[PDB]
């Protein structure tokens, strides 16, 4: 309703860097809000693309941002009669970023790895890696849970069980309130997908540079399966956290698996031991149900609700024709231990190929009426096809079915405006929570400031 679409703030990265692919708000130890931005095609030292991360201080006028520097050099370690190898070319550093406390986590999901032993090897594969930074202190750490030192032959001989070589750890990421990093790794276990969790404190305290393979003992990874419903499911394509079992001393995980069960798609709600509490199935195959997931209480009863995006959902139209427009599904959490039911509300896109539901961002309470609100991206939506973000306000029965406000991309065609979104943080300290929108195709981020309702 009350985001200001007249006076925006723009931040810009280098041409071709894909600045804005991922973003998040970052509070320093003093509570000053900045914006961390991922730019996964930023050029590294060898003029190869490796990705980069930027830490943008808040300024109404916007502009350019300083880099948050991470080590971009390939590494080699000869140890235990093996040669360990990291490969950072085209790794996509900044394909995800998330901030928690005064720490920033930025991931390179396509970072490759190999282990050589005489004439054999593990195979050069995208295990992914995450980089952690405490900007104020300069501390750095890394987390790469899928790295191994098993040779190719052993997986073949063991029928490719526990195969974490193609994890792409960090493809999605989220941090629990208590400071546990949870990474989505959609290539895990031969493309089933997995989640890897470890406390941030333990990641820092257990990392040392140059070791490359090291134990984070407090970590927990999800499990492999022989159920072909899970095969090529990309479980971990998206991830979120919330409270869904009623016990406030446990955090639950929400995991998107957009190609689950032969491309039907699913989202699952799990406890922290990776035991499934609920499963929501997609409605239409190939719709990519689970592409995006969001958790927020939209109806003011104190119980978290779930929003799921299916950006390629084809709506039924006249004369038995289908139109790809995208769809968002709201599931309100009921009282007690019961199942999440049928969706409470279906929101559906209007512009063909708009990909409505590609990103869904909790906004907090934008209009300050007591109910939390959301923003849904259609990165190729709008009448012009340039991209749109739609705001939906919460209310006692869920969300309103018609948007309160629509933000048309200020960038040219192809910008992917809305592909990344973050809200619920007041960046200018005016008492209303604001929205940041990435447009990686234009290498820019737009900040929308919330203002008093008119």
């Amino acid at each position, epitope marked *: 309703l009350n985001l200001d679409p007249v006076q925006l703030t723009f931040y810009a990265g280098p041409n071709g860097s894909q600045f804005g692919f991922s973003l998040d708000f970052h509070k320093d130890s003093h509570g000053r809000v900045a914006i961390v931005v991922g730019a996964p095609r930023t050029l590294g030292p060898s003029q190869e693309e490796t990705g980069g991360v930027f830490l943008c201080p808040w300024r109404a006028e916007g502009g350019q941002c300083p880099s948050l520097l991470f080590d971009l050099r390939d590494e080699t*370690r000869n*140890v*235990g*009669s093996q040669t360990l190898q990291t490969f950072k070319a085209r790794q996509g550093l900044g394909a995800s970023v998330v901030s928690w406390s005064d720490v920033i986590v930025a991931c390179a999901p396509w970072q490759h790895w190999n282990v050589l032993e005489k004439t054999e090897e593990a195979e050069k594969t995208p295990v992914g890696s995450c980089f952690l930074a405490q900007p104020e202190s300069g501390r750095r750490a890394e987390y790469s849970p899928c790295r191994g030192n098993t040779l190719s032959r*052993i997986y073949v001989e063991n029928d490719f069980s526990w195969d974490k070589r193609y994890c792409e750890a960090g493809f999605s990421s989220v941090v629990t309130q208590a400071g546990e990093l949870v990474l989505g790794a959609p290539g895990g276990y031969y493309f089933l997908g997995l989640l890897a969790q470890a406390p941030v404190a333990d990641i820092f305290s257990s*990392y*040392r540079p140059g*070791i490359l393979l*090291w*134990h984070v003992s407090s970590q927990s990874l999800s499990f492999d399966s022989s159920n072909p419903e899970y095969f090529d499911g990309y479980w971990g394509y998206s991830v979120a956290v919330g409270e869904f079992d009623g016990d406030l001393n446990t955090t639950e995980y929400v995991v998107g698996a957009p190609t689950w069960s032969w491309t039907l798609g699913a989202v699952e709600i799990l406890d922290s031991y990776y035991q499934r509490l609920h499963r929501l199935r997609g409605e239409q195959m190939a719709s990519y149900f689970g592409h995006s997931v969001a958790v927020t209480d939209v109806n003011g009863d104190g119980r978290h609700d779930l929003l799921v995006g299916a950006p390629l959902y084809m709506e039924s139209r006249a004369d038995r024709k289908l139109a790809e427009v995208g769809r968002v599904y709201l599931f309100l959490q009921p009282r007690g231990p019961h199942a999440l039911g049928a969706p409470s509300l279906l929101l559906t896109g209007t512009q063909l190929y708009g990909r409505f539901g590609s990103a869904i961002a909790p906004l907090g309470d934008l209009d300050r009426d007591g109910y939390n609100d959301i923003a849904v991206a259609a990165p190729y939506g709008g009448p012009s096809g340039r991209g749109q973000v739609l705001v939906f306000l919460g209310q006692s029965e869920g969300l309103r079915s018609r948007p309160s406000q629509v933000l048309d991309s200020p960038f040219p065609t192809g910008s992917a405006f809305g592909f990344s979104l973050r809200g619920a943080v007041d960046i200018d300290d005016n008492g209303y929570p604001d929205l940041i929108v990435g447009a990686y195709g234009a290498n820019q981020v737009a900040v929308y400031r919330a203002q008093p309702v008119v």
Partner: antibody
Amino acid sequence: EVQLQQSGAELVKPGASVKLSCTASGFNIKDTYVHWVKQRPEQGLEWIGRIDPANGYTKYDPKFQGKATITADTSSNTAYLQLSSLTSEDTAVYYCVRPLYDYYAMDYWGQGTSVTVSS
Amino acid sequence: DILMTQSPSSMSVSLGDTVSITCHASQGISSNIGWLQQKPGKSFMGLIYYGTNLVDGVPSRFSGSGSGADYSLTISSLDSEDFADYYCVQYAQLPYTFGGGTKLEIKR
């Protein structure tokens, strides 16, 4: 708190076999490699071999091939060193070892099991 | 196999000294070395891994340095607990191999 708890002093005859145990306290034995190390007063410290208890795969110094056999049971959170066809030269103190952080390191040690071979 | 030549086999020193124990490998081991401590009639405790990294719990008066084939464990300001046996171990290659050890004894 990580602690490797080994079996007591063994006292066996030449030609006999013996199976020493190393039980993990405060952690899961599958977490890291577990190594066995032989100590004598004169010859000093010698690496026997290692096992990954998660999968049971082992490596040995070729000096100990035949003699020593390392196994593990994740159920009982325990690793074992069996020594066969015992002789005077096998009289030593045996330690189980695991790394702290580095996959390949040798940081945490059990208290040692003393073996004596005599008639 | 890689030979680890540890020197000196012993030294008679006093409380408060800075002393150094060196270890020489037969080839380069790119810092894949650990340092170990065995107190009298006791088991072993890890001091250093990967050349320079203190094991959790170890005091900073212990420090590791070196590169290539030549490494050092330095102990600043000797404590009474530091009179003990020390060994290097390399893990650049299987089989892992150890130094012959160094005993710190009391000067008088």
